[PDB]
DNA sequence: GGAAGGAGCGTTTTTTTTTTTTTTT
């Protein structure tokens, strides 16, 4: 039943299929983003399907988040260290008391809190329904508000966009 | 009542599908093994894609077919909300199946799916691949977005050969006890143009009309594919021969001018003999005549002038 | 103050000073305006067609026709694309330029004009008993630039509501006017003024402005540089007078539109060099011209005739040039993007010269 | 009621026996209904050949006089978008018959006007509910039908009406009316029909009107030409002879006189001349090329209006120049 | 799959009878099942809102008639059923009812 | 009298009844006898501008129903109305399905009142192909209570199925032979005094369009009245009003073309375009001058006929007059 | 000290009618 691309998925950053220079650039940018006062708030990765964007982001997070997360002052949800290095937005989630177009707005409003002892890398791969004009406009507003926010502390935000042509549809 | 032979004789097992011997054999291997991956099945109409996917699902899931298969086609609602709720809930369902067996989502005519739904399908495929597998069926594999193609094994079905069509026709004839002649079966296969559905429909029509499947009886009802007539018209070495073909074989048979010009463009695109300059000039003339027809001047004189220009270019 | 083009504009038929026969015909039309048919004035640009229409209206109604104001009318397309049009109005007539709406001009005909045609204009009688009725006058500027759909929409509006409305359309060429619209109109040809009449008008303006003129020949030259466009003649006269301390002399340069000089330079470049790189630079010049909203067909005319003015070219070269000009003018008329056709014309000329 | 109807509708066939010209198709469909094995049908053909009449007659035969209760008819005048296919057609095809009267019938008249998305949605509706429902698709332009839909339908071609069927229907109409038609008038009517019965019936009705006393007046070829305002064969022959033999001035005068005698239009003269020249035996083929190209250009120009005199002179010059090749 | 069962009491279900498809002979132990699209079934909701009593009558030809009584306003709704019931639906219905 | 003089002559003298329609008897007879037969078919009027199609349909509708009943039995749509596919599928269909209104006793007493309505689609050639397709079964199904009348100038713009459905009526061009009586009647009514042959000249200039001829007659009458000399109108005045180029200018153009010098032709054309002559009229006059001349040979006439046709076709596409005229003259000079 | 391989560049984006999906309603 297991698919090979899942069974033999990389177990470390070195096994990731990525050009060395691109990996170095991404690692430097992400490491800079984690610093106390980082110039860059959003890292936007773009490229074709299956070129290791999300994979390299996850592998890099597995190293960066533990090194930069403040040790908790004896506080945590469960007994385990809460290995939640990457927080991802889920586009198919539907809750009772929230209109669809606002779902992403809610997500970011929580994602802002994942800093310091709750540090986590925010990853956006499954985007909202940007084909809907109003949803796309709201998404752009939220991205701009995150970019222009006056919050002293924010977590790194990574947006992975896979570029592909839309076949003509009747 | 009596079902049409096209549906009455729909293969129910993978061993009754003719053509694409390698692909059908691989599907049989998958059915006996169980490890079905995400797959895309592409090909021209009436060659067995839908039948193949249904037969494979049935063989894989046995009695669990009812609870383990979710089928959706262009006639059902397949928008983004459907992906968000129905497909998601089906993929979340915990179903106890024999080892190596997974739930199957059949998406027939997947090409027509909207962009939002296709993009939403990425996450469900990523999350529920351990228990669910997707079988897309389409005519243009390129109409499925690349992120979805990246997860599936591609399987392209080719046109059926005359041998396979003849074998299936003979099986159907034996089952129905139909009287025929070799020339009649030849005519049916020639008019089918590789489409088994059309072959069966034409055989049934001929049998109903006269019973005995001869060449003359077949050609009384069935017409030779007009693309071949258009090719003959275009390739005639004499202007008068082209005009005669256009008059006798197309115009007086009731073929519309727009159909004639569109078929001429399609055929000229695939003329291997001609040079590139001549081909592109013929395409230009066909396009100009098509423009004239669309404006309302769909007269026989316009088509004759198009033929005259094409002949001039050939010289 | 106002530009001399408008400052000394005649405001009555008796004030017209050129094309006396046209003035007589217009006065004959104004004799009994009760049964005035729809009018279509055609002739070279800048000759005084709009001035003559306003003089005719003044003859029918009075000087109040010159008390103009502007209003903005909003239209919504089937796609909810809101947009606006400028409507000029005087207490007796309206003025519209639907062509400014591009492909949406038809909407203006279907919504605005029709409504204007449908609303019958009545008023209480000052002295007599009962209401009095008066037809409305509507001027359609740039009639030749209307799409075929708008022209078709005009037909039954003109015919059915003839009691309430009378159209006066103005164009520089009747070739783009569909046959039914011409059939529904009285056609009035407006010839351009001769060089002598242009010089007389310019001399009157000079005397009024108290500008010292060395010799009348200058005015003649100005006329010969305007190609019969009186508006251009007056504009250049004003520019030259201002640039020469209100003192014109035989040595004073004649000021021409900048794009005309650019086209002359382009013609010289085309004549001098015929190569691919020359063609790319010609593309750059053409795109610069188009960026200023100069119509493509106007560019083609001016380039064609500037090329035909070259002395070094022979008869065969000029014949080929005019052939290509006609072909690519048709292509522009039937085309969507003008750059293709302008480039094709220039490339064909380069091939024929080389 | 029927008396007030236009003849094109008053003479619509009611039973399959009243449909003429399509003997093969009628034979096959009648046997299919006799055995009750009707498959999904496609009726492809040019205007006024009997497609709609044939399908309605077949529905009447299958369901008798109560066919309107178990037949779902849709045409271009109705919206048939993907939503319509998904809801209305789907529900009709997926529900039982009124009284278990075998299968249901869905007629999609003028289906070439349907959108690609709706046609795509139709595929599985047709396939899954074949046991209970059968589809009929009528069209004049096949290129508007998706390949998947074409693959699913048994195709029948309605040919342009042969002369014999038109003669039989004309005889029926003449008997029904109190009308008398001359053989020459019948030949002219058949020639101008081009295989369309609607034109035959409309011209016949107009000819009956033209008669002062239809009870005793007989329709002649002159009446037909007057009603249609079409040129006579003698006019076309004279014009062509003048063009091919007389000088330019004489040819121009002949064309002007022939046109002005009965107000003939240039397009019909061109069409008749083209018909005449199609049978001409030309020793030089280049002549045919010139004739065809120039005359097609003139026809296209006429289609947009233009100057009539210039177009006529152009026709004369084109024919002369083309026939200079035969020299 | 969900179920709504009407109590077997002479207060809400006044009477129920199965006629074996002839309106005459009463047969016990036989279940009559009618399959409908909710798009059509739900169209009687507003009529039932004012209804005082509702009479259901299903025939063998797949026709269901609902007579609604509210001197008064009387309503009659007739609907056709689907051709056949899928195997999964039949199994689920049997499991729910047994 | 002032109120009656509030209308241009084309609207003033629009035919009131079918008897007033001239030169179109081949269709008028059928339409007239339809009043007694009550067997009106679907109609397709087609023809060149100003031949009497709209007038004929309006007169027929007036004769069939009357001033009052007409309002309930007629639906008129033209190019000034929105006629998209949705309009055809909703408004036109609803009207076609409408029950036939009950005529009053007066209407029945005075008019035949056939038991059907009429939908007039004027300028039908402007409708799209899909919208036209939406009309087919609407016309076929409701022919018992509704009859359609399509009107156009370019019949090729009507899709073939609609043309097959409709009975066709071609309206002929109105020239000096068949329309002179109406123009003479109009001139007599308005007391226009013109020299013999003036009406002939107007009708020849109009080239099949009686509306243009009537407008020209009105313009000439206005000029004569303003002059107030009591003299008859002359053909020269009519030609001047019509925009016809004077014969001397045409002779000058012909001489320049014969000379063959490109520069001289260019200069003369540049000066000639000053007067604002319409290129179509000049091309027509040149065709008349050259085709009928006996001083040129057959090959010259063939070549010039094709050149003139090409130039006229280019002009019909709204091309630029100066360029086309200069090209035509240069080509002719090279023959 | 020869290529062989690779990365980066070469970019911006309304509109006619008509049909369709989506989200909130
Ligand atoms: N050495 C490897 N390097 C990268 N991916 C691998 C490797 N081995 C297996 N895989 C799998 O291949 C897939 C890589 O594809 P992605 O990382 O998703 O690329 P992508 O740029 O994110 O494209 P999309 O937007 O997901 S279609 C992952 O599922 C990995 O688990
Ligand atoms: N290889 C085949 N062998 C036997 N019968 C076939 C075969 N292909 C098509 N048929 C017959 O034609 C009918 C339709 O076959 P399908 O599998 O639906 O073709 P298809 O390729 O799926 O057509 P599309 O892509 O949905 S238009 C079957 O029920 C069979 O009766
Ligand atoms: N085979 C025929 N036999 C007798 N009458 C015919 C025949 N075909 C057409 N007609 C006559 O013409 C009328 C129209 O026939 P239709 O069946 O509607 O033609 P059609 O092929 O459906 O036209 P299209 O494709 O919708 S434009 C009928 O009412 C008949 O009166
Ligand atoms: N046959 C005619 N008899 C009398 N007057 C005519 C005739 N034809 C045209 N006219 C006159 O010209 C005017 C216009 O006639 P119309 O009926 O509108 O012509 P038309 O064919 O409808 O023009 P188009 O196709 O809309 S450009 C009429 O009011 C009449 O004054
Ligand atoms: N003195 C005088 N000036 C005129 C006359 N005719 C036109 N003009 C002026 O010359 C200019 C002509 O431009 P315009 O009226 O727009 O002509 P159009 O573009 O053809 O409509 C205007 O500024 C007028 O004031 C005339 O007869 N006499
Ligand atoms: Mg990934
Ligand atoms: Mg399939
Ligand atoms: Mg039909
Ligand atoms: Mg009209």
Residue numbers in the entry:
A (entry chain A): 63 to 232
B (entry chain B): 7 to 321
C (entry chain E): 1 to 354
D (entry chain C): 9 to 335
E (entry chain F): 202 to 271, 302 to 329
F (entry chain D): 19 to 353
Question: What did the published study say regarding this structure?
Answer:
Reprocessing of a recent data set of Rad24-RFC in complex with 9-1-1 and a 5’ ss/dsDNA junction yielded a 2.1 Å reconstruction of the open state that revealed that Rfc5 also binds GDP in the Rad24-RFC complex. In both structures, the specificity for Rfc5-binding guanine rather than adenine nucleotides is imparted by Rfc5-Arg52, which coordinates the C6 carbonyl and the N7 of the guanine base. Our observation that Rfc5 in both RFC and Rad24-RFC binds GDP instead of ADP was highly unexpected, as AAA+ proteins generally utilize ATP and ATP is sufficient to fuel clamp loading by both RFC and Rad24-RFC. Moreover, as no guanine nucleotides were added during either purification, the GDP is likely to have been co-purified with Rfc5 and thus be a very high affinity ligand. In the case of Rfc5, future studies will be necessary to determine if Rfc5 is a functional GTPase or if GDP instead serves a structural role. The α4 loop of Rfc5 also undergoes a conformational change during the opening of the 9-1-1 checkpoint clamp. However, the conformations resolved in the presence of PCNA are distinct from those resolved in Rad24-RFC:9-1-1 as the α4 loop adopts a β-hairpin in the open Rad24-RFC:9-1-1 structure and is disordered in closed Rad24-RFC:9-1-1. Thus, flexibility within its α4 loop allows Rfc5 to bind to two distinct DNA clamps – PCNA and 9-1-1 – and stabilize them in their open states during loading. Consistent with this notion, we have recently found that the 5’ ss/dsDNA junction is exclusively coordinated by Rad24 in Rad24-RFC.
